[PDB]
Design a protein around this ligand. Structure first.
Ligand SMILES: C=CC1=C(C)/C(=C/c2[nH]c(/C=C3N=C(/C=C4\NC(=O)C(C)=C4C=C)C(C)=C\3CCC(=O)O)c(CCC(=O)O)c2C)NC1=O
Ligand SMILES: *[C@@H]1O[C@H](CO)[C@@H](O[C@@H]2O[C@H](CO)[C@@H](O)[C@H](O)[C@H]2NC(C)=O)[C@H](O)[C@H]1NC(C)=O
Ligand SMILES: *[C@@H]1O[C@H](CO)[C@@H](O[C@@H]2O[C@H](CO)[C@@H](O)[C@H](O)[C@H]2NC(C)=O)[C@H](O)[C@H]1NC(C)=O
Ligand SMILES: *[C@@H]1O[C@H](CO)[C@@H](O[C@@H]2O[C@H](CO)[C@@H](O)[C@H](O)[C@H]2NC(C)=O)[C@H](O)[C@H]1NC(C)=O
Ligand SMILES: *[C@@H]1O[C@H](CO)[C@@H](O)[C@H](O)[C@H]1NC(C)=O
Ligand SMILES: *[C@@H]1O[C@H](CO)[C@@H](O)[C@H](O)[C@H]1NC(C)=O
Ligand SMILES: *[C@@H]1O[C@H](CO)[C@@H](O)[C@H](O)[C@H]1NC(C)=O
Ligand SMILES: *[C@@H]1O[C@H](CO)[C@@H](O)[C@H](O)[C@H]1NC(C)=O
Ligand SMILES: *[C@@H]1O[C@H](CO)[C@@H](O)[C@H](O)[C@H]1NC(C)=O
Ligand SMILES: *[C@@H]1O[C@H](CO)[C@@H](O)[C@H](O)[C@H]1NC(C)=O
Ligand SMILES: *[C@@H]1O[C@H](CO)[C@@H](O)[C@H](O)[C@H]1NC(C)=O
Ligand SMILES: *[C@@H]1O[C@H](CO)[C@@H](O)[C@H](O)[C@H]1NC(C)=O
Ligand SMILES: *[C@@H]1O[C@H](CO)[C@@H](O)[C@H](O)[C@H]1NC(C)=O
Ligand SMILES: *[C@@H]1O[C@H](CO)[C@@H](O)[C@H](O)[C@H]1NC(C)=O
Lengths: 1002, 188, 49, 49, 49
């Protein structure tokens, strides 16, 4: 039968204690929610192959299971008889009925044991209880994990380790042993490679896990390294079409390359004139030469000989000659000696390889063979791959001897005397060097491997004359000239190729790839998700195609709403109502069409006082890191190796110090705008206004206000250190309280000079004057205004005592810095190609000369991590400085005064602003005037009275239908039109829209 | 197509056009009132008189020259059309930005054609020519340098993005102060 | 090659993070510039301005 | 190198040495006597004039 | 005038550093290119270079 593994079969992968850590592991595991096979076998035995590891859970009451068997074909015979553990490794004879007794009355596991390899016996020991087990083997280790718990049941259970007795055999096959005299239940799972995310608690025990290659939500959790994911879009992985098959396409030639004639030749030229045979336009078999044992050395640069049969070469040059015995290694790239510089010089970038075999048979003769000659003196070294053939004698001195042999005038060619009498260190060697040159041209020489038919419109692994690649092939329209072979892109990419066999041009395009993103609501809400396969047609994977890619798991909706989660290209997704995930086009807002007319105005008759919050970062944590503790932890020779990189570390320290100073400067310029610390009076007769929620209270030791306290509760050793800020939070609170006291008791006067007292309602009248509202409006509604203000303040408290996301601008900053630091620490766990990430291990394992190589490889990469961190911090600090300059400007203009700038100090007509300190930031409570219930009125730009035209001094001419009044612009306060609130200019025949009415005159 | 991709902007150009048309409609039909609260209708010439008042000119000056003013405005608009239908360099501030980004990307691709001291700039050629133990040396030499090109590109993009954010904050300030209101700030 | 890359650490995760931050910042910029208005106003059919 | 302290961590009997969120060897069990010792780096820090 | 002076100093500081890095081996045998080129032949010289 079958059943489901409700998150079962997870063990401790190693004997490491981790507490309160979310650690991601990757090894053999039982996938979550898998088909675990149920067995209720009665009373030869079932055979359940060891694929990679077995999970085994039984609610044992009898344990008629008697043994475990492992092997390739069937030889491991492990037996737990419920009292002791007996392991045998012998080439056992498997019986016709493989089983044993239930007590023991049988010996049918095997008839005998011969040529035994291992044996062991362990200690003797003895539906309510579930007993879970995991059996696997890794590179010789045979690991058993277990867990025995009273009660597949759902829930969770971690598996502790147990005996590991390594053997190391090839196991392809498994049996659990049965026995013959009821039945019980046992479930068999099957491990496989898998990545998990494990959640250790504070006791160090695993309490939960995520099988993160299961479903998109779990992939999201695993990329975020968290068990909870908030609403949003997360790019989790990269989708790409795998190639279906491989295409090999080589030219139709079969003439074998002439290798016998440059190897079996009776004659080889002398080294001073090495003979160069060319090889092109043939099929080369390099396996025959490498597999031949006739060659003393066969060593290759730029290629591996075993792969030579799978390459295509534009040209090959076989240069053959003979040399003296232990000069053989002078024929190599970047080697010095007599023949490597005077006779045959290889390039440094030599691709190809060298073949040498002793020939003391046909190149050696008694009496000495003097035909094998070599130049010994030359005026200069030889260039790579140049032959110098000459006989001019070597003018070792300044004497122009001009061909006569004497002192300081020597013959340059000297001959070996080759005999069979000579020893191994002299006897001649026959050498041939094969110089290929690789793909920059249509290949001529190719290996023996055969072609195959081509396919089109399908992603494949193509191989055109050694041109390897992966992509989809399409019939093209490009006009290749008959000599052209393959095209290229502006990006220097192999766009097109001509097939060698048939002369047609095929466009290559990379088969589709792209990111995959997970649209989720907050996991607090639900667990449904959609996935966006970016920029890919989803014929290549309800289902809905959009400009950003294909979105699956989300239904399309015609009704437009405001955005919740941005997909892109005008598309957002949201979790709506049964409940599901919808995707829709964004509604930019309520459609509106104000009823414009050329004699209609709309004037407010009331207002509201609105308090909004603007939260600004000001500073960030003053961190500082020193190299010679981070890079080279207390290792003096590592520091010596660091000294030769120069002054990188001094300047890194300087940069971080500059950042740290800049933070204190930012805080100073924001908060320390006031010179004296003002104090509010004990009395709070502020005209009915109520500042108790923002002014400090002495009830607490820290002299923060109520809202500051709410804000402070809403946001939360490798050479690193965190310097304390110069200004403590209490000093910041004092600055803010001083600013509040000055604003309340003195107005804007304390920002210009000495703080001049003024009753609050009077500066309020001033500020209403400042937005084009006459001050009477305040005094006739003062109580109302106060109440509104107080109510707004109350709402702020609520909106800050419920939702923590409002402070996100600050929180993100903190998170970002922490994120960087965590990365900076984890880069200390990286090898960077060295043998280890731990310096002391390198220093204890190796001696100095290779140890310093590994240490240099580590330093190069730890230094790079530091530079990356410091650059990111500098950029982020510039951003923070911009925000702090903005905050200082707002404090100067919104708090210390009244700004006419629109939407600078809140939405509306700015009346005033309050500062409140927040961790690494500042919060402005912007108090604004927002007009309210309005009415249409008929209006006219002017009024004709006696032929002369009358315009309003300040205000507009309105009418309720019968009578014409003049009113101030932002508040309906009609007044009788009089020769004092109007002024006259000219006659009433030029103004477009003037009307007829009387104008009173006292 | 070397792992690069260009994500589409969240707001399509039509949505941007709708936003701008909404701003124009509010400015024309309501004045600055729609930036402070509900959009309050007002005849255009009246908010024009308001704005002349805002620069220290009495509103009569407008009503006695309204036609002239309108004509001038219209003429100016016409000239703008001409100055935008002839010379393409006026948009250079935007064009440069585009060019810069493209430039960077082109560089980022061409660095895939560089050996960085290896035997080849193509990974599959290295993998087909050599066995694992020396192949990984060359591959490490390539990675060290492709990673460096990426870091260079990302650092440049971060700096350029900071510059663009500064410009966008300025643009938002101008929209708030110049469009949604009337700024007394000189040459702003 | 990816296995050889894994031993350089989390350079690539943070590079992707940085570019993603830039991309989000662009949409934020556009929002703060153009989406200052709350309602989509429409001009009347008549053009008596 | 570091200072060793008597710990309170609850190592499971198969566990040998602990580690930090920073992948640092926080604690070790002594091979001879089965007790758990916290390792902390002995104090360092800058000096300013 | 320090606000200006610092700027000047900073630039000069950077340049001085940029010059002193020409005196660093970076693990090579010498910080001078011509010495490397005069002491060694091409194939190992290019490694140091
Ligand atoms: C088969 C291999 C096998 C393993 C790996 C094993 C491990 C194992 N079983 C234990 C308890 C125990 N184990 C068993 C018996 C069993 N528990 C089982 O998983 C099975 C299959 C049986 C036999 C039918 C019992 C009865 C206890 C004690 C339970 C009790 O406290 O009453 C213990 C704790 C011993 C202690 O007190 O320190 C270990 C380590 N026992 C075994 O027999
Ligand atoms: C202006 O608006 C305020 C509220 O925004 C009005 O005050 C409210 O008046 C109603 C009477 O209908 C009371 O029930 C409320 O308690 C009042 N609220 C407050 C906060 O005082 C006020 O009446 C409006 N003025 C005009 C002229 O309409
Ligand atoms: C200012 O407002 C606060 C509310 O935030 C008032 O404090 C309340 O006062 C009443 C009695 O006056 C108490 O019953 C409440 O328990 C108080 N609430 C809190 C949170 O302290 C304060 O009284 C107001 N000031 C004035 C002068 O009226
Ligand atoms: C427009 O306003 C005028 C001015 O108040 C209104 O005239 C007054 O109307 C009330 C009641 O209708 C009378 O008690 C006053 O004596 C009137 N005053 C004058 C000077 O005539 C007029 O009714 C209003 N009309 C509309 C349509 O609202
Ligand atoms: C077992 O697996 C098959 C295919 O993998 C699946 O169709 C079936 O539903 C699974 N069994 C159970 C009980 O889920
Ligand atoms: C496990 O954690 C709990 C949490 O309160 C604690 O009380 C207990 O002592 C810890 N250890 C064990 C063995 O439960
Ligand atoms: C032989 O080469 C010719 C050249 O065009 C080609 O048409 C033909 O398919 C080739 N045949 C084989 C068996 O490769
Ligand atoms: C001739 O050369 C081939 C290939 O190099 C080799 O297999 C063969 O043994 C040679 N002939 C003799 C007689 O050795
Ligand atoms: C996706 O594939 C279909 C298949 O016919 C094609 O018509 C369409 O143009 C492709 N591209 C899209 C939908 O963007
Ligand atoms: C949405 O609009 C499309 C118009 O193309 C229409 O075909 C579809 O039926 C509509 N769906 C709903 C649910 O109204
Ligand atoms: C002004 O008049 C228009 C058209 O009659 C109407 O739609 C609008 O609601 C009126 N204003 C108010 C505040 O009612
Ligand atoms: C504009 O005003 C004129 C006179 O001032 C009037 O005749 C005309 O009807 C008004 N426009 C509209 C659309 O009513
Ligand atoms: C205003 O009154 C004058 C004379 O009193 C008259 O000529 C003119 O036509 C009137 N205009 C209107 C709109 O009533
Ligand atoms: C020998 O090992 C035991 C194991 O616990 C330990 O207690 C004892 O101290 C050790 N003695 C020596 C001399 O190492």
């Amino acid at each position: 039968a079958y059943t489901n593994s409700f998150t079962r079969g997870v063990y401790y992968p190693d004997k490491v204690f981790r507490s309160s850590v979310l650690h991601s592991t990757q090894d053999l595991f039982l996938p979550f929610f898998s088909n675990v096979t149920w067995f209720h076998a009665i009373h030869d035995n079932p055979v359940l192959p060891f694929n990679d590891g077995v999970y085994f859970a039984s609610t044992e009451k009898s344990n008629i299971i008697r043994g475990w068997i492992f092997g390739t074909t069937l030889s491991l015979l492990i037996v737990n008889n419920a009292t002791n553990v007996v392991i045998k490794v012998c080439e056992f004879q498997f019986c016709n009925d493989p089983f044993l007794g239930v007590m023991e009355s049988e010996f049918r596991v095997y008839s005998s044991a011969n040529n035994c390899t291992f044996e062991y016996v362990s200690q003797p020991f003895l539906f309510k209880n579930l007993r879970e087990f995991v059996f696997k083997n890794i590179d010789g280790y045979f690991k058993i994990y277990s867990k025995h718990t009273p009660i597949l049941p759902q829930g969770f259970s971690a598996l502790e380790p147990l005996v590991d007795l390594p053997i190391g055999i090839n196991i392809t096959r498994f049996q659990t042993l049965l026995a013959l005299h009821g039945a019980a239940a046992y479930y068999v799972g099957y491990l496989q490679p898998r990545t998990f995310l494990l959640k250790y608690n504070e006791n160090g025990t695993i309490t939960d896990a995520v099988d993160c290659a299961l479903d998109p939500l779990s992939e999201t959790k695993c990329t975020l390294k968290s068990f909870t994911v908030e609403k949003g879009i997360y790019q989790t992985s990269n989708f790409r079409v795998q190639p279906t098959e491989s295409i090999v396409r080589f030219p139709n030639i079969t003439n074998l390359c002439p290798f016998g004639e440059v190897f079996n030749a009776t004659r080889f030229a002398s080294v001073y004139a090495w003979n160069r045979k060319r090889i092109s336009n043939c099929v080369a078999d390099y396996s025959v030469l490498y597999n031949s044992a006739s060659f003393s050395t066969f060593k290759c640069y730029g290629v591996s000989p075993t792969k030579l049969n799978d390459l295509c070469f534009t040209n090959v040059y076989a240069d053959s000659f003979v040399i003296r015995g232990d000069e053989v290694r002078q024929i190599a790239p970047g080697q010095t000696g007599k023949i490597a510089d005077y006779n045959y010089k290889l390039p440094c970038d030599f691709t190809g390889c060298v073949i040498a075999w002793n020939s003391n048979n046909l190149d050696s003769k008694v009496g000495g063979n003097y035909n094998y000659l070599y130049r010994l003196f030359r005026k200069s070294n030889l260039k790579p791959f140049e032959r110098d053939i000459s006989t001019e004698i070597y003018q070792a001195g300044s004497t122009p001897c001009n061909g006569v042999e004497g002192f300081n005038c020597y013959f340059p060619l000297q001959s070996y005397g080759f005999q069979p009498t000579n020893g191994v260190g002299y006897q001649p060697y026959r050498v041939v060097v094969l110089s290929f040159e690789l793909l920059h041209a249509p290949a001529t020489v190719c290996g023996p491997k055969k072609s195959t038919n081509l396919v089109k419109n399908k992603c494949v692994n193509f191989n055109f004359n050694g041109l390897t690649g992966t992509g989809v092939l399409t019939e093209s329209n490009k006009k290749f000239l008959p000599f052209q072979q393959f095209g290229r892109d502006i990006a220097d990419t192999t766009d097109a190729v001509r097939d060698p066999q048939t002369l047609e041009i095929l466009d290559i395009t990379p088969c589709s790839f792209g990111g995959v993103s997970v649209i989720t609501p907050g996991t607090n809400t639900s667990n449904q998700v959609a996935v966006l396969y970016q920029d890919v047609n989803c014929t290549e994977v309800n289902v809905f195609q959009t400009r950003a890619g294909c979105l699956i798991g989300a239904e399309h909706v015609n009704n437009s709403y405001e955005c919740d989660i941005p997909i892109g290209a005008g598309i957002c997704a949201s979790y709506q109502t049964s409940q599901s995930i919808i995707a829709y086009t964004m509604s930019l807002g309520a459609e509106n069409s104000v009823a414009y007319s050329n004699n209609s105005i709309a004037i407010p008759t009331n207002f509201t006082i609105s308090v909004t919050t603007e939260i600004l970062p000001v500073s960030m944590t003053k961190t500082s890191v020193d190299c010679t503790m981070y890079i080279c932890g207390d290792s003096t020779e590592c520091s010596n190796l660091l000294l030769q990189y120069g002054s990188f570390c001094t300047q890194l320290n300087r940069a971080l110090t500059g950042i740290a100073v800049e933070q204190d400067k930012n805080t100073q310029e924001v908060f320390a705008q006031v010179k004296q610390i003002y104090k509010t009076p004990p009395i709070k007769d502020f005209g009915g206004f109520n500042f108790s929620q923002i002014l400090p209270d002495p009830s607490k030791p820290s002299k923060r206000s109520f809202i500051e306290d709410l804000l402070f509760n809403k946001v939360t050793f490798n050479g690193l250190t965190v310097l304390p800020p110069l200004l403590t939070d209490e000093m910041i609170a004092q600055y803010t309280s001083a600013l509040l006291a000055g604003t309340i008791t003195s107005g804007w006067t304390f920002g210009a000079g000495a703080a001049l007292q003024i009753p609050f309602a009077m500066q309020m009248a001033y500020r209403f004057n400042g937005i084009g509202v006459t001050q009477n409006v305040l005094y006739e509604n003062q109580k109302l205004i106060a109440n509104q203000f107080n109510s707004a303040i109350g709402k702020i408290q609520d909106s800050l005592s419920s939702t923590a996301s409002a402070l996100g601008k600050l929180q993100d900053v903190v998170n970002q810095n922490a994120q960087a630091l965590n990365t900076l620490v984890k880069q200390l766990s990286s090898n960077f190609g060295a043998i280890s990430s731990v310096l002391n291990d390198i220093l204890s394992r190796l001696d100095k000369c290779e140890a310093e190589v590994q240490i240099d490889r580590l330093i190069t990469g730890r230094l790079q991590s530091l530079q990356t961190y410091v650059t990111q911090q500098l950029i982020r600090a510039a951003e923070i400085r911009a925000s702090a300059n903005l905050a200082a400007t707002k404090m100067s203009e919104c708090v210390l005064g009244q700004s006419k700038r629109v939407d600078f100090c809140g939405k509306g007509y700015h009346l005033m602003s309050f500062p409140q300190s927040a961790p690494h930031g500042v919060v402005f409570l912007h108090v604004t005037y927002v007009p309210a219930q309005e009415k249409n009125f008929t209006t006219a730009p002017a009024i004709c009275h006696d032929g002369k035209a009358h315009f309003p001094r300040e205000g507009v001419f309105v009418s309720n239908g019968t009578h014409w009044f003049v009113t101030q612009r932002n508040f309906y306060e009609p007044q009788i039109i009089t020769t004092d609130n109007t002024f006259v200019s000219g006659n009433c025949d030029v103004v477009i829209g003037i009307v007829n009415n009387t104008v009173y005159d006292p």
